[PDB]
């Protein structure tokens, strides 16, 4: 797999959400984000390749996408209600979660 391409999808679609006009554009971007996040959780960062999948480091790496996907879901609930501004403000959580996980 390739964890870097999944972050491309995540970052690119987060910018689509910020500059979106309607709830459909937001829902479509979040949908692509959720798939990318699920695949990203499977891979291993190039800094933890000599550790174990059961080690605390990999457990914490996967934990970050548990949180990230929960926040995608937070925004999807709102987009599904047609609440554009609310869904955009909920996706701002993803900025923080992204910023906190660049290890």
């Amino acid at each position, epitope marked *: 797999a390739d964890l870097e391409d999944n972050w491309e999808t995540l970052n690119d679609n987060l910018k689509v959400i910020e500059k979106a006009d309607n709830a459909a554009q937001v829902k479509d971007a979040l*949908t*692509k984000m*959720r*798939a*990318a996040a*699920l*695949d990203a959780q*499977k891979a291993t960062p190039p800094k933890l390749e000599d550790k174990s999948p059961d080690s605390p480091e990999m457990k914490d790496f996967r934990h970050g996408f*548990d949180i990230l*996907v*929960g926040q995608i*879901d937070d925004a*999807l*609930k709102l987009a*599904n209600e047609g609440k554009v501004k609310e869904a955009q403000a909920a996706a701002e959580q993803l900025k923080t979660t992204r910023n906190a996980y660049i290890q």
Partner: antibody
Amino acid sequence: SEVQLVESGGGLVQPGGSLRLSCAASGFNVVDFSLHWVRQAPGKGLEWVAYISSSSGSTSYADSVKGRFTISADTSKNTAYLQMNSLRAEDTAVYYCARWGYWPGEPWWKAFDYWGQGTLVTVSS
Amino acid sequence: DIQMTQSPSSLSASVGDRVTITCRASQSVSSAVAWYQQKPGKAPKLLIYSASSLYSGVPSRFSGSRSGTDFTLTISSLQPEDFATYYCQQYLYYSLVTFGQGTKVEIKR
């Protein structure tokens, strides 16, 4: 010692009428799982209808039933309901209810691991 | 609206044959694909989840695989009790569920 779901309330309803289906859970708590309705018209495939989170209150519906169906839950009796209004002939189907665990964790990944036996709704004059 | 394109719609195979059912997702759903077996008159039963995990209690002659957006259900050694209609399903999110059109499997004898 076994999880099961039991749909009831199915039967004949006149066109334009209303009918309420129930999905009674046993062996597990509806607060712990999302609950979904999937229907199958005679000879046709599976069509997802609606879902409810009993814990949060969040819902969603298929475009084909949006504005006509309302899904709800009563946690005290461990049961979900599908209230179907303005029924039409093309709503005739076996209606199944199924559980699907919450994110995060293996329960989310197991999708519809338990289904009820299904109840037949017939829309006809 | 994510589409699952399932093929073939029907097939007939002898006991012992290897049977392959395919499902194409219109966009990425990660590995959030399940396969179900439905006997006539009964609720679907889960066979495979997360594209390739064998559900507990399902015989190991059933298996699944993912390749990008291409998903495959394989029955390695078809048994007479395997006659059914099989469905793929993508479950990327609670509100997005769609199913494949189904594959009716008949037994030749």
